[PDB]
Amino acid sequence: MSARRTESDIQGFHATPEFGGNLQKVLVDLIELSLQGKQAHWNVVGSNFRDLHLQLDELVDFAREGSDTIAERMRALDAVPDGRSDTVAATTTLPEFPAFERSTADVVDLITTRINATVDTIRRVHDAVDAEDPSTADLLHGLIDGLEKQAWLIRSENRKV
Template identity: 40%
Template structure:
């Protein structure tokens, strides 16, 4: 498969979103293990569902990068160096703190994906644009869930 300029932009877009999606999936699992509070059970369960949904998106993003001839990278070093997300605090997390952190991370993923969707070159790759649009749609639904629980 030959790589064109548009493929390079598409893989760059997908890689940027993959990094934050993979990072938030990890943070959601970390929060799942450490959340405490009056609404513990519902938040604990939702965090697990969120981590699973984000892992599914990470897989789709990575497979699209590979299909375009790129090399997806969600190694821990890459995530720590390139994520645009804030770090999750270590230790106990109050339910409201965990929800606010997930809300902020979801907001950031939508912003990164949208910024790439606003790039006309990415729009010329309808499969990548569709994938990024789907990620935006799903993270905004999850963001609604986070906000509804606060």
């Protein structure tokens, strides 16, 4: 007990409400991205169907894992996430996805646009999130890297050189 601490109750780090809202925005955008990825996965037709069909499923898997990680971090810092359908639909920022069958060029353009919007949201939040908690800033770094790689892999088909 030379250097041992005599404290009987050691408390943890608590996030501020601004921190909670800044993480909530990321959460809702990731959930909306998952839903739109599945929709575009089902309803795409045309030339080069198979490759896009598989890449969209990879995108959806990554988005689901990321959203779960963010929500678990919010719980770990003693905040309350909200991932209900009403809240997601009412407060998401991604533009609405059109219905019916869409050819592959349209799907490529739409998905590139929505991935870019999600990454923009993460980039806007990162400044304050890093100024408060670098450990959460690191998770944001990982999400940005993954989403940008997926965006490149999807948008590269439609390039003309």
